[PDB]
Design a protein around this motif. Sequence first.
Motif, PDB file in Angstrom:
ATOM      1  N   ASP A  94       0.856  -1.215   0.000  1.00 56.55           N
ATOM      2  CA  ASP A  94       0.000   0.000   0.000  1.00 56.55           C
ATOM      3  C   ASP A  94       0.883   1.254   0.000  1.00 56.55           C
ATOM      4  N   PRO A  95       0.680   2.212  -0.901  1.00 53.05           N
ATOM      5  CA  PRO A  95       1.530   3.455  -0.879  1.00 53.05           C
ATOM      6  C   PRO A  95       1.358   4.373   0.361  1.00 53.05           C
ATOM      7  N   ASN A  98       4.150   2.458   2.257  1.00 53.42           N
ATOM      8  CA  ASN A  98       5.096   1.762   1.383  1.00 53.42           C
ATOM      9  C   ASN A  98       5.631   0.469   1.996  1.00 53.42           C
TER      10      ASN A  98
END
Length: 111
Positions: A94-95, A98
């Motif tokens: 998931d950004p 990160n």
Amino acid sequence: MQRIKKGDKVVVITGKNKGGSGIVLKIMPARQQAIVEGLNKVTRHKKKDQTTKRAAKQSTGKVQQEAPIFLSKLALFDQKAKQQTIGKIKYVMDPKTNKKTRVFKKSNNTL
RNA sequence: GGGUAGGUGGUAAGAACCUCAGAUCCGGAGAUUUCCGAAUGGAGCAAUCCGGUAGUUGGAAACAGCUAUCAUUAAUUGAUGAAUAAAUAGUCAAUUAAAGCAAUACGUGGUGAAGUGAAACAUCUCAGUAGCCACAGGAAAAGAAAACGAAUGUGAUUCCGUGUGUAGUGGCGAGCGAAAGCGGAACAGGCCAAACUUAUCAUUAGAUAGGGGUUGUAGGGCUUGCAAUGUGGACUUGAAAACGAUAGAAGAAGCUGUUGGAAAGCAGCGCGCAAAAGGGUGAUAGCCCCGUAUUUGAAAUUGUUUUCAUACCUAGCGAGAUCCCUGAGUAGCUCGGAAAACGUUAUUUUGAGUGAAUCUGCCCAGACCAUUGGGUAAGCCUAAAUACUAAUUAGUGACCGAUAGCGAAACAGUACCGUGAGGGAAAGGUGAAAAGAACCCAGAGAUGGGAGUGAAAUAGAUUCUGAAACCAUAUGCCUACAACGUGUCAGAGCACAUUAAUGUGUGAUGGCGUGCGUUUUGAAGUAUGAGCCGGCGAGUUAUGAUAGCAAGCGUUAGUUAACCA
RNA sequence: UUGUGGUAGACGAGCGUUGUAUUGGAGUUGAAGUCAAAGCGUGAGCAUUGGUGGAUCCAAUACAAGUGAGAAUGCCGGCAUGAGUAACGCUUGGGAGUGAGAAUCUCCCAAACCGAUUGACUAAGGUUUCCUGGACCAGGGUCGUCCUUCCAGGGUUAGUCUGGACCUAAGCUGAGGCUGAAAAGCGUAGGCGAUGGACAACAGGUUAAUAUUCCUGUACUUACAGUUAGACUGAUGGAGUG
RNA sequence: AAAUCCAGGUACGGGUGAAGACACCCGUUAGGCGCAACGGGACGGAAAGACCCCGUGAAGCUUUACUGUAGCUUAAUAUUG
Ligand SMILES: [Mg+2]
Ligand SMILES: [Mg+2]
Ligand SMILES: [Mg+2]
Ligand SMILES: [Mg+2]
Ligand SMILES: [Mg+2]
Ligand SMILES: [Mg+2]
Ligand SMILES: [Mg+2]
Ligand SMILES: [Mg+2]
Ligand SMILES: [Mg+2]
Ligand SMILES: [Mg+2]
Ligand SMILES: [Mg+2]
Ligand SMILES: [Mg+2]
Ligand SMILES: [Mg+2]
Ligand SMILES: [Mg+2]
Ligand SMILES: [Mg+2]
Ligand SMILES: [Mg+2]
Ligand SMILES: [Mg+2]
Ligand SMILES: [Mg+2]
Ligand SMILES: [Mg+2]
Ligand SMILES: [Mg+2]
Ligand SMILES: [Mg+2]
Ligand SMILES: [Mg+2]
Ligand SMILES: [Mg+2]
Ligand SMILES: [Mg+2]
Ligand SMILES: [Mg+2]
Ligand SMILES: [Mg+2]
Ligand SMILES: [Mg+2]
Ligand SMILES: [Mg+2]
Ligand SMILES: [Mg+2]
Ligand SMILES: [Mg+2]
Ligand SMILES: [Mg+2]
Ligand SMILES: [Mg+2]
Ligand SMILES: [Mg+2]
Ligand SMILES: [Mg+2]
Ligand SMILES: [Mg+2]
Ligand SMILES: [Mg+2]
Ligand SMILES: [Mg+2]
Ligand SMILES: [Mg+2]
Ligand SMILES: [Mg+2]
Ligand SMILES: [Mg+2]
Ligand SMILES: [Mg+2]
Ligand SMILES: [Mg+2]
Ligand SMILES: [Mg+2]
Ligand SMILES: [Mg+2]
Ligand SMILES: [Mg+2]
Ligand SMILES: [Mg+2]
Ligand SMILES: [Mg+2]
Ligand SMILES: [Mg+2]
Ligand SMILES: [Mg+2]
Ligand SMILES: [Mg+2]
Ligand SMILES: [Mg+2]
Ligand SMILES: [Mg+2]
Ligand SMILES: [Mg+2]
Ligand SMILES: [Mg+2]
Ligand SMILES: [Mg+2]
Ligand SMILES: [Mg+2]
Ligand SMILES: [Mg+2]
Ligand SMILES: [Mg+2]
Ligand SMILES: [Mg+2]
Ligand SMILES: [Mg+2]
């Protein structure tokens, strides 16, 4: 990352013990084993040995401990879902942080 | 840099710690690196001993710590300097290189046998092999015609097929065996000496440093003009880009029932696939796990290629002069050897001696001469195709599976043998999981019998399966007046009941009866070989010839070798 | 119809083992292996059942071979026979004790041999074999509670001893150098090389194991510095001694 | 322990036979199995006969056997006037 970590709930999908839910207490990566509490209870015939300050007593009878279990026989247990089921996990990143996180593939539940 | 949640190497549990300010682990780059060993301060019986010099710290000094340096040879430079005036020899100092090892493998050179074959042996072969030594390199060697060779010819070297087992060479015996030509792999040609000229050396230069030149349908120099500013290298530095190598990230798809200790087997109903390679998971899993196909990613080091610029090298066609240069103890020749297929001979080479010529020149075309033709020796360098694998990565096998495969699956060049060089073994498997047998009994104990765990304990550490020889126990039959290669054909009695078959086990008694291989005219053999059991143990491969059988193609047939995909 | 003894030998037809390629099939409801049985074939050979065993195997058609063991004084491993036979490699009796077990272990008393040696000190070599406690897998030609065997711990103290820091003999090495196809051989100056020369410690005591080494007592030698007094000091060379 | 060992349940006389038999033919004798002895036989065991012969085998040695050669000696030639 690893499929099974120290702490997450796990069950067994093969063997004499079916549907045995437990918490992994320790993971041996080299031998691909996993100690799960309450499962694979073996009772070594504890003898008596007296050669040390603690060995002077070493009270050991029919102590039942934990035998290691192959990591293939283990499967992660779902908790967020209302109807809990056993499935496989992904490794999406998931950004937001990160960081790699495991997510099931039959649902959208993290870890 | 990657990457996480575990780690403190194996026989290995426990004690004590480390680790989410990112550990252990993997990759790149560095730090430290005792002593011996080329060993190199001197020695020495290897891993030891004894030092010198210049610093610096303690001591009052001897001394003791802590640093750096101290071998030999060769080259260059400088200083010093004998016999003997000068000068060399020599001495000293400084700088730069060399030493050694290994890849049981390839290259070059020197030296160089014998076993053997010729059915003996000396020429010859073996064989320029083994061995010994020197020098390397990533390949080495070779290399640009004083050539092949018989033609309106080819145009460095190297390697493969054919030419062919041909021409030839051989006590013409055993044997040996090309060079042309043709088809392929790769392809590249460059540079000095001399002339001529410049500058400098007591310029006696005959020497040093530059310009000019690199040849054969001759070239270059001398003098005189035109055209040239390029193309290409075996080439230096940089910059940029691309393709990789040394860690990695992501990576789809299954439940139910049955036998079972355990399912993944089996059956039913499904699903995924650029993934059905493989490994593990309690049996035989595409969908349990790790992976694989596929898409990706490098801070640092390193490899290949391309582009741009930049050094160095690299350039045509005429005229006249008729002058100069073109590699000397060299080519030839003689005396002894050798290399080439040749057992010495046209060609190549050399230990001793002798010794030429200068484009109307010299060498060659298997003695030699003349004509014709080919080529330019006595100077140098040269990528590619070629040879090999100790090692790194991936992978394969009608290869081996503990007497096999490397001698060595285990800690094998070990144990062990020998003064030494050297020689040189055997030995793997519990169970899915140690859950490795607590406890009771006998015994001094090991151990055994129970108990317990386990599906199985007749899987118990003596640990997968467990054959025969060999040693013991027992049901049944026979055997103590009996001459025996021990069996065979008949045959009572005894005891059982089967792959149901005129059944099986023993055999009182009658007839007959001197083993197996080897080698011999002839073996029971007073000829030979085997104590028994089990494993291993001897007609193969490569290249050619002949013949039998069969198939394909056929009467201007048939079939390719190397090599390329 | 004629035939069918047979070595050397010629020819023809088949069996079996391992693996590969195509097909099909069996297997934890038990495959291979392995044992037994009173089966089938003309022969190599092939089945059925039961026990043991625990995971692969079978049939057909072709192909490729490290493809067939009774002999080689064959190789390796195991086991017999000889045979419980020869042999057990110079030394007695008893008392007490330990121990589960004693001719063999411990102690004591004798007894018998050595006594120019089986006694004591060391060189060489051996390399922990030395001392203490424990054990009796293996080794001990019997036994063993015991061992020079095994396990655990411990043990070797130098200015004067034996050798280096001192010196040379035979001999070795040996810069330069000479010789030699190469490797190398010889050899000068130097350097090593004791089995020799020079050099200062004796007596007693102590631990289970060390002692001119540790301790006590009494000594000696060589260096360096300071100091006092005297003296001119005199070698890398010469000579004497050694 | 040892060499040995084809499997053995392993008599004697005459004859026969590869020519000297525990095993063959014809007769005679002998209950089964040990122990202590001594060596008649098992052409007994150990050593692929050393004697003899064979091999177009090996090695050592000898010589006026053959072919060579180290060394020694003589001459030409180069260093060499
Ligand atoms: Mg890091
Ligand atoms: Mg010969
Ligand atoms: Mg011959
Ligand atoms: Mg012959
Ligand atoms: Mg070259
Ligand atoms: Mg991944
Ligand atoms: Mg996956
Ligand atoms: Mg699978
Ligand atoms: Mg000529
Ligand atoms: Mg020749
Ligand atoms: Mg000419
Ligand atoms: Mg001619
Ligand atoms: Mg010329
Ligand atoms: Mg082996
Ligand atoms: Mg074996
Ligand atoms: Mg040794
Ligand atoms: Mg038992
Ligand atoms: Mg056994
Ligand atoms: Mg077994
Ligand atoms: Mg009777
Ligand atoms: Mg009678
Ligand atoms: Mg009779
Ligand atoms: Mg009879
Ligand atoms: Mg009969
Ligand atoms: Mg008979
Ligand atoms: Mg035979
Ligand atoms: Mg004969
Ligand atoms: Mg005869
Ligand atoms: Mg006989
Ligand atoms: Mg005989
Ligand atoms: Mg014979
Ligand atoms: Mg025999
Ligand atoms: Mg055998
Ligand atoms: Mg043919
Ligand atoms: Mg016949
Ligand atoms: Mg088969
Ligand atoms: Mg069976
Ligand atoms: Mg064979
Ligand atoms: Mg024997
Ligand atoms: Mg016996
Ligand atoms: Mg006897
Ligand atoms: Mg006796
Ligand atoms: Mg006796
Ligand atoms: Mg004795
Ligand atoms: Mg006695
Ligand atoms: Mg006496
Ligand atoms: Mg004595
Ligand atoms: Mg010892
Ligand atoms: Mg003792
Ligand atoms: Mg003791
Ligand atoms: Mg004993
Ligand atoms: Mg003292
Ligand atoms: Mg000395
Ligand atoms: Mg001495
Ligand atoms: Mg003592
Ligand atoms: Mg007769
Ligand atoms: Mg003989
Ligand atoms: Mg002869
Ligand atoms: Mg001969
Ligand atoms: Mg002379």
